[PDB]
Symmetry: C2
Subunit: 338 residues, 2 copies
Amino acid sequence: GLDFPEYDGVDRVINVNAKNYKNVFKKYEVLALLYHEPPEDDKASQRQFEMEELILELAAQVLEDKGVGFGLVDSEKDAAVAKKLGLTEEDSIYVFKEDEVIEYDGEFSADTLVEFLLDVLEDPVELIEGERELQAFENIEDEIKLIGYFKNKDSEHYKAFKEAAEEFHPYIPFFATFDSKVAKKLTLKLNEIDFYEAFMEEPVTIPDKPNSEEEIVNFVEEHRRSTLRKLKPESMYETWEDDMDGIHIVAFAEEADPDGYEFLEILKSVAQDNTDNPDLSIIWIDPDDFPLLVPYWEKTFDIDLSAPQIGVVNVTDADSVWMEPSAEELEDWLEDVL
Amino acid sequence: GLDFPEYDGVDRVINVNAKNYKNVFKKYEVLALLYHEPPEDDKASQRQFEMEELILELAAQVLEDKGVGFGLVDSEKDAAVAKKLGLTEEDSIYVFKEDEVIEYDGEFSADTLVEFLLDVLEDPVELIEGERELQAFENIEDEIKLIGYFKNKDSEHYKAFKEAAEEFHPYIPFFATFDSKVAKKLTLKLNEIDFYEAFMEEPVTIPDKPNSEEEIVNFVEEHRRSTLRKLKPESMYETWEDDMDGIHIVAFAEEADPDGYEFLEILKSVAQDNTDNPDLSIIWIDPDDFPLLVPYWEKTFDIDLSAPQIGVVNVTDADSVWMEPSAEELEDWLEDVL
């Protein structure tokens, strides 16, 4: 009776250094690097480091037959490897998929890291050919998505789109179609790129068609903050550090709970009415995606996370106010505390 | 700008031994113990142990303000503490909620462990009072659930039900109602206990009413294997080791995918037609609940886990056959290979 697969105890995470680094880069397809401060002499410090290495050791085993290497570049001792690579953010992971660098903005857990890298392994523009890929695109809602329509893979404007997708890969989905039947369904004229905001049904089309790469990348950096964003594990620190000037409006709702989902609907209707407003960002957190954190959110905030919640929290003091409702009722309580 | 909470590096996991153990049991409400083989002298062995302790160290920090202690009882060196406690299964976790023992049958990850213990912390019979708790019960489908109706909390038969719930806590949900309005909705006559099989709509009622504890526990051990079971992380090894005589029929379906869910519907209809059959167990795995494992399932089994799949796998050789469909088509292909 054969069982499931466990951690074997074998070390696979590499000590990338001055001797090393050139050869680790040519041995792997995509390579993941924890650029890090050395372990400070005390126990607490070394156990936090003990942990990070062992989470990367798990990701290593799992992603071994797929060509993802993992490495540690020490900030003081491999300082020259850091300089010559573009390793500037201190205890963070950096991913090298064929020369160009992806920064990892999320959760330090073997779970989200492996999903991130699997997404990294994929092609940056995902194609639409026939209605079963179109009604896949149509259903994405929790993220910004762009879609474009071109002549074929050779179109000068599609190479522009595809290079813009690379700069946002894997975090923002870029789709393309060369079928005029999908373009008819989707509105699209030739070389038109429509941008869809997270949780919006209505798209803004990128203006001076046909768009160059720089034009598409200016557009997307200019429209990254959606009105309703979702705290996602692979992004969690990118969305948290984009506070609307010291403040965050945070809504907890379990999308699975009947009551959580109903509140999610109201909240989606609040964002759709004030999306013309730029200062706003409502961050929605589904407690269910962050199990280890909901006892922290429950005693800090002094809320029951079994219920849908809506608050405003001071991004610095961790200080907050929570509401004790309709869209218009949710709006008004937001007017009175802000 | 304050950030999220990290592992502090502080040790909280206890070395439970002959001197220790009596006093660790009176210091904590619920206590979790990894009974374990010592680390074998080599590196591979000690790194696998290095890991388990550090996963329990995370669960420890998280569940610190809730009263769950964590411990290590060595099988050779704390052999007498193991004997006198009922610690017989080798590298496994055992949970002591006020004297009576719960065995942990699942995934060794900080993620599922914390959810398990939070569920452990709850009361074993969950009450139904008014239609918003009834349409909560009505929606549970992936597990066996029992519901009973009594006079009030004092009813001799309810203390029987509640003691049966304790023996299955936290894995099988036991519900009770004292409201005759819910009992009318649910069918129930007084002190009637209805058993609902996983993914079945129709309940078997426990026979010689009113049921004693032993009668309710005989019933449930006799009806644990549902026709359609779900590989759940908190249970994964309990459901895998209940092979239907060397074999398992395993279906992959992403419940979120439009196509995965449609296959889930067909599969639910196959189980509902052959549930009168006892040898059958179809295990359904949603790949999305096991991210670290789907590259293993994809190259072993040589299947695309993006698609719904249905196979038969030899529980020992890991050898398998997979189908290249309607309920009747799914039945027939199951008749030809078995």
